[PDB]
Design a protein around this motif. Structure first.
Motif, PDB file in Angstrom:
ATOM      1  N   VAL A 283     -18.766   8.403  -9.319  1.00 12.42           N
ATOM      2  CA  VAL A 283     -18.002   9.557  -8.887  1.00 12.42           C
ATOM      3  C   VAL A 283     -17.538   9.333  -7.444  1.00 12.42           C
ATOM      4  O   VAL A 283     -18.320   8.881  -6.612  1.00 12.42           O
ATOM      5  N   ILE A 284     -16.263   9.619  -7.162  1.00 16.01           N
ATOM      6  CA  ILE A 284     -15.739   9.502  -5.799  1.00 16.01           C
ATOM      7  C   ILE A 284     -15.237  10.850  -5.253  1.00 16.01           C
ATOM      8  O   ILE A 284     -15.039  11.019  -4.039  1.00 16.01           O
ATOM      9  N   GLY A 285     -15.048  11.818  -6.143  1.00 13.17           N
ATOM     10  CA  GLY A 285     -14.443  13.071  -5.730  1.00 13.17           C
ATOM     11  C   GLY A 285     -14.543  14.241  -6.692  1.00 13.17           C
ATOM     12  O   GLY A 285     -14.873  14.089  -7.884  1.00 13.17           O
ATOM     13  N   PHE A 286     -14.258  15.427  -6.153  1.00 13.44           N
ATOM     14  CA  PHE A 286     -14.267  16.656  -6.938  1.00 13.44           C
ATOM     15  C   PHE A 286     -13.345  17.693  -6.319  1.00 13.44           C
ATOM     16  O   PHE A 286     -13.566  18.139  -5.182  1.00 13.44           O
TER      17      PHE A 286
ATOM     18  N   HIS B 202      -7.104  -1.276  12.546  1.00 17.94           N
ATOM     19  CA  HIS B 202      -6.549  -1.927  11.359  1.00 17.94           C
ATOM     20  C   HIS B 202      -5.641  -0.981  10.568  1.00 17.94           C
ATOM     21  O   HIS B 202      -5.088  -0.035  11.138  1.00 17.94           O
ATOM     22  N   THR B 203      -5.474  -1.226   9.271  1.00 16.90           N
ATOM     23  CA  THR B 203      -4.634  -0.339   8.451  1.00 16.90           C
ATOM     24  C   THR B 203      -5.338   0.277   7.227  1.00 16.90           C
ATOM     25  O   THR B 203      -6.015  -0.430   6.468  1.00 16.90           O
ATOM     26  N   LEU B 204      -5.158   1.590   7.058  1.00 16.24           N
ATOM     27  CA  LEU B 204      -5.595   2.346   5.872  1.00 16.24           C
ATOM     28  C   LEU B 204      -4.411   2.625   4.945  1.00 16.24           C
ATOM     29  O   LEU B 204      -3.390   3.142   5.383  1.00 16.24           O
TER      30      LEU B 204
ATOM     31  N   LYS C 256      -2.396  12.282  -2.717  1.00 20.36           N
ATOM     32  CA  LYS C 256      -3.341  13.388  -2.887  1.00 20.36           C
ATOM     33  C   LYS C 256      -4.486  13.263  -1.900  1.00 20.36           C
ATOM     34  O   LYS C 256      -4.915  14.254  -1.289  1.00 20.36           O
ATOM     35  N   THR C 257      -4.968  12.035  -1.735  1.00 17.68           N
ATOM     36  CA  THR C 257      -5.998  11.757  -0.752  1.00 17.68           C
ATOM     37  C   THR C 257      -5.553  12.166   0.659  1.00 17.68           C
ATOM     38  O   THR C 257      -6.288  12.864   1.377  1.00 17.68           O
ATOM     39  N   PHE C 258      -4.353  11.759   1.060  1.00 22.48           N
ATOM     40  CA  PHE C 258      -3.893  12.162   2.378  1.00 22.48           C
ATOM     41  C   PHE C 258      -3.832  13.687   2.523  1.00 22.48           C
ATOM     42  O   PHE C 258      -4.292  14.246   3.537  1.00 22.48           O
ATOM     43  N   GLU C 259      -3.274  14.360   1.521  1.00 18.88           N
ATOM     44  CA  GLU C 259      -3.082  15.820   1.616  1.00 18.88           C
ATOM     45  C   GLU C 259      -4.396  16.585   1.627  1.00 18.88           C
ATOM     46  O   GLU C 259      -4.444  17.723   2.076  1.00 18.88           O
TER      47      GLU C 259
ATOM     48  N   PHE D  69      -7.820   2.721   0.617  1.00 18.18           N
ATOM     49  CA  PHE D  69      -8.698   3.776   1.105  1.00 18.18           C
ATOM     50  C   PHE D  69      -8.851   4.900   0.089  1.00 18.18           C
ATOM     51  O   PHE D  69      -9.593   5.850   0.326  1.00 18.18           O
ATOM     52  N   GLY D  70      -8.171   4.787  -1.048  1.00 18.15           N
ATOM     53  CA  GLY D  70      -8.290   5.794  -2.096  1.00 18.15           C
ATOM     54  C   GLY D  70      -6.968   6.442  -2.472  1.00 18.15           C
ATOM     55  O   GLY D  70      -5.932   6.121  -1.869  1.00 18.15           O
TER      56      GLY D  70
END
Ligand SMILES: NC(=O)C1=CN([C@@H]2O[C@H](COP(=O)(O)OP(=O)(O)OC[C@H]3O[C@@H](n4cnc5c(N)ncnc54)[C@H](OP(=O)(O)O)[C@@H]3O)[C@@H](O)[C@H]2O)C=CC1
Ligand SMILES: CCc1nc(N)nc(N)c1C#C[C@@H](C)c1cc(OC)cc(-c2ccncc2)c1
Length: 157
Positions: free
Chosen positions: A13-16, A38-40, A45-48, A92-93
């Protein structure tokens, strides 16, 4: 260098509901230390879900939306654009980007959260048959970090 950076639980699981299911300050420090300078690369959806770039590194967002333009964020519209990015790039997701990139990365920085949470998004399945353990370090438990957790660096064989 192209790397995955992710925290997942015992069932991947990574999220909910567009949030992380756990609150782990040691993991945020870990992320800061790895990615500063560095760079992500992250999905829209992750950013928001956070809504603000992380200071002191390049923030790149992949989206189909041609109107996207946030102060302090760079935009891409193709997976292919990731390869043109200079330096050390961390995927990063979230789930969608992980699925798209897991067969393409050099290595993975995974924080294994040793619990079972309710989730609606997952890290894809993988086998140690394909990944060498470059390092494995247990997180320390304390007042503010109360879920057992392990930092893995895996390198594709
Ligand atoms: N525990 C952890 O280590 C992490 C957990 N998470 C969690 O993951 C969850 C979100 O995952 P998920 O719902 O999959 O969303 P994502 O963050 O992966 O974003 C999906 C969006 O990214 C854009 N996108 C992805 N691939 C492409 C492509 N090939 N071309 C153009 N655009 C693309 C699209 O944006 P558009 O629709 O605008 O076109 C798509 O809708 C949240 O719960 C979050 O908290 C996230 C990161 C890390
Ligand atoms: C850390 C959680 C985390 N841990 C690990 N090991 N890998 C990851 N990929 C993430 C992650 C993540 C996403 C949700 C993310 C994106 C983002 O894009 C800006 C900012 C943050 C963030 C900004 C500030 N404070 C907490 C979290 C988190």
């Amino acid at each position: 260098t192209l790397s995955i950076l992710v925290a997942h639980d015992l069932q991947r699981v990574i999220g909910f509901e567009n949030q992380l299911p756990w609150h782990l300050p040691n993991d945020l420090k870990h992320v800061k230390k790895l990615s500063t300078g560095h760079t992500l690369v992250m999905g829209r959806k992750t950013f928001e879900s956070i809504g603000k770039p992380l200071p002191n590194r390049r923030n790149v967002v992949l989206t189909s939306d041609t109107s996207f333009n946030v102060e302090g964020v760079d935009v891409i519209h193709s997976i292919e654009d990731i390869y043109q990015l200079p330096g050390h790039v961390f995927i990063f997701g979230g789930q969608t980007l992980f699925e798209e990139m897991i067969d393409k990365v050099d290595d993975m920085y995974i924080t294994v959260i040793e619990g079972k949470f309710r989730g609606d998004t997952f890290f894809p399945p993988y086998t140690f048959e394909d990944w060498e353990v470059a390092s494995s370090v247990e997180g320390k438990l304390d007042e503010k970090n109360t879920i057992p957790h392990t930092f893995l660096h895996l390198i594709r064989k």
